[model samples]
Target: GNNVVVLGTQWGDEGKGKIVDLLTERAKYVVRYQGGHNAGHTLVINGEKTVLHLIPSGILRENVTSIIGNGVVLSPAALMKEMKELEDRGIPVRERLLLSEACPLILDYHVALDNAREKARGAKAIGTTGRGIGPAYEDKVARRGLRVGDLFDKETFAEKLKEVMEYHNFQLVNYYKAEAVDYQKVLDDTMAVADILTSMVVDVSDLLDQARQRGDFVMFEGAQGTLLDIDHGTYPYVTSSNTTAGGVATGSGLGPRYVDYVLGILKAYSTRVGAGPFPTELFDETGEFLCKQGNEFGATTGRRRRTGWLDTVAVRRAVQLNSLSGFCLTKLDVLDGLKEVKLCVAYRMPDGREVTTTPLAADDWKGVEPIYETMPGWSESTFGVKDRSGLPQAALNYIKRIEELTGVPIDIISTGPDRTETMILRDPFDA
Candidate 1:
C-alpha cells in the first residue's frame, strides 16, 4: 500500500526526474518499470544538471535503491557509459543499482535494424531516438531476443545471437540495403559486460515484494508518457512499451493492488519531442515563446520539441487510463511574462463533432480544433517561491482551473528545476 507510481501524464518530458529525486527521500526503492535508455529524466540539483537515461533518477539519492525492471530494454554499452559517469561523480551506483535478468539486450544488430527501418521509412519515419529500443522490444515480443540472463551461458547466448542476427541481417541486407552487423562483434561486446551485469542482476520482483513486506516504500518510475503508450497511445507513433500506470504491474511484476497511489506529472503546458498528432500544437509566436522559456528540447535526442498549450482532453483520458491519484504541475515558471494563457477544454472535430475525450487512432486527430479557455497570465517571477501563498493570484487561478478541468487535485507545483523550488501540497508517499 505504500508503493506509488510516478509517470508523465502528457507526452513525456514532464519534469519527472526532479519529482522522482524529490520523492526518493521517502522511497526506499525506485523501480523503472518500462522504457529504455530512450527516456531522459533530467534532474537539476543545486544548479548542477544530471540527465539519466537508462538508470532511475533516484540514483542521485544515496539511500535509495534503483531497480531497472524487466519492462526496460538493457543496452550494455549505454548502461556502462551511464554507470561510469555516475561512478566518476563519486556515487556508488553499482551498490545501489539492481538489474532484472529478464531484460532484453539491445545489441548492435538491433541498432542497425532500427536505423535501417527508420531510414527506409524516410518521410514516414516515426522519429525514433535510433537507440534500438523499439527493435529490442520487437525481438523481445517475437521471443528471439537474448536477455541479460542469457549472457551467463556463453554457448546458448552465442547460438541464440547467431540465429537472431542472421534473421535481422537478412532483412537489413536484402530489404533495407543496409550493411549487416557482425555477429561476432555483438557477441564479444555483450560477453564483455556479462560478468558486471550478472553481478547486478537479481529477481527484481522478489526484491520489491520483500522490500514492501519490510515496510519500505517503493516508487515505480514510468518513462515516456500516457499518450505514448503502445496500446492506448496513437498507433504507429507511440513508444513500443506501455508508458501508463498499468505498466507498473506488468513491467515490474508488482501487482496493481500493491500500488497505493499514482501521481501523474503534467507540464504547465504541453510539449512533444517526436512526431505525433498533437491537436493543441502551437505554431505562432506563443509557441516559440513557450519553447524558449521552457527550454523545449529532447534530453535523449537533443531535438527541438514541438510546443503546445495545455490539452485537458488528452490529459482527461490519461487521468482515466492511469487512474491517477493526483497531479504534479511542473514548469509553472515558464508561463511567467505572458499576458494570457489558454487551456484546451475539448476538441472540435472537422465533422462538427465536439469531443471531450481523445480519439482512438492517430489519424483521427487530424483536422481537430482545440476549444480554448483563456485565462489571465501572471507577469511576476515564480521561479523559486516555495510557498503556495507566495504565487500570484492569476497563477493560482490557472492552477485551480486546471484542477477543475481535469477533475484531479494539483498536489505539487514545481516552479523551477531544482528540488528546493517545489511546493508540495501533498506527498504521494504520504497520501
Candidate 2:
C-alpha cells in the first residue's frame, strides 16, 4: 500500500539484500540510494552466493526496476568488475538496472588518495577498505566533483579530472608520503568505460516522478549503517556519506512525504566493519566463536567484522533518527549456542545516571556498560528450521521480547543467509 525504504541501523552488514530480494516480489521498483563499492549485499538463492555492491539485489528478481539514484557515488571500475563477475556466472544484469546521470563517479584520483591516506595513517588508520568512497564523497561535498553526465563531455571531463587529480595528488605526495598517481591512465580507462555506462544512466529523478505518478510501490535501500555515517556516526571512524534515512531524500531525489515506511535493519547480534568505538565489544572466545561459527566476514571487503552484543542504544538511536516503522532482525541463527547474551539497553553516564537513549555524539556519549537480560538460549538449531513455528521457542520469545521492549514490530527474522531461512511476522505495529 505504501513505499518502504529498507536501511541499516548499526555499522552496516544488516542483511538488507536478503530483505530486498524477498520484498521485490511485491514492490515495482527498488532505488539504491547511497554509498558506493563499500556496500556489499549478499543474497543466497537456489544455493548460489551472489554479492551485489553497486547494483541493487532486486535484479535477482524478474521485471523489478532497480534504480541507482543520485545519492550514490558511482564507482565505474567496481561496478564493471561486479557485473563481470555476475556475467561470468551466467547471470546477466542488463534488464533491471539503472544509474543516475547526476550521480558522482569515484574517479581514479579518489582511489589513489584513499590508499595514500590509509597508508599514511599506518596503524593509526581507521581501516578503510580502500574503495575510494571517502575521497570521492569529499570531492562531492567540496563541490569539485565529477558527475556521470560529464562522461559525455571530453573537455569537461579532462578539465575536471585535471583539477581533482592535481589537488588530491598534492596531498598524496606531500602529506601521505605516497608516490605520484598516474591519474591520466585512470582517465583513459574511465573514457573507455563511460561508453558502457551510458546505457545504464537515466534521469533517475524524472523516473521517480513517473513511478510516483503511476502509484508504484517504491523501496529506497541504503548502503552502510547509521553509526558509520560521516556526520552522525562516531567521528574520525565513519564513512564519507550520510547513511541515515535522511540520505534517502538526497540519495534518491525523493520528497520526504513519499517515504511511508523505514524498516531499520537490525542484526539479531551486533556487527561492525573496520575501526570504531564499540561499546559492547566482545574480544573473548565468544566473539571469535560468532565470527568463525557464523563465518562473519564482509561480502565486499572480505574483512573480518568486529562482533559484539546487540547495542540496543545504537538500535534505539536508529529507531528515533529514522522514525522506523518496524525492524528486520537478521542472523538469529548465529545466537543459537551462546551461553550468555547481552544487550546495550542504556548508557550509564559519567554523572552516574543511566540514560535510555541513543545519543547525538556517539563518541562523547556517556560511559555505557551493556545492561543485559539473559534470555533463554535455544537447544534446537535454527539453521535447521523448516518453518517459523519450527524455530526454537526460546528464540521466538527473544523476538517477542525485542518487540515488546522496542515497540517496533518485527517485519521478518532471518534464521540463516539463505532466502528460505526467514520467519516473516505478519503483524503491523500500529494495528
Candidate 1, residues 1-431, lDDT tens digits: the string is 38989999988778787787788898989898888896677655435777778888788787888999998999999999989988887878889999998998998988888898889999987677788888998988899988999978889889988999999999999989999888888888888888899999899888888987887898888878898888998776787778899888878887668889999999999988767799999999999999888876554444558999999999999999999999998988889999999999998988898989987693467789999999999989988999977899999999999999989999999887677888889888777
lDDT of each: 0.86, 0.77
Query: Which prediction has the highest lDDT against the true structure?
Result: 1
| Tens-digit lDDT track of model 2 for 106-181 | 8777787888877778878766778787777778789998989888887789888888788877887888767777
RMSD of 2: 3.0
**Which whole-number lDDT from 0 to 100 does residue 397 have in model 2?**
83
lDDT of 2 at 325: 85
Which pairs of residues collide in candidate 2?
71-251
Looking at model 2, report the run of 10 residues with the lowest lDDT sum: 422-431
Q: Rate residue 23 of model 2 by lDDT.
A: 79
Q: TM-scores of all models?
A: 0.94, 0.89
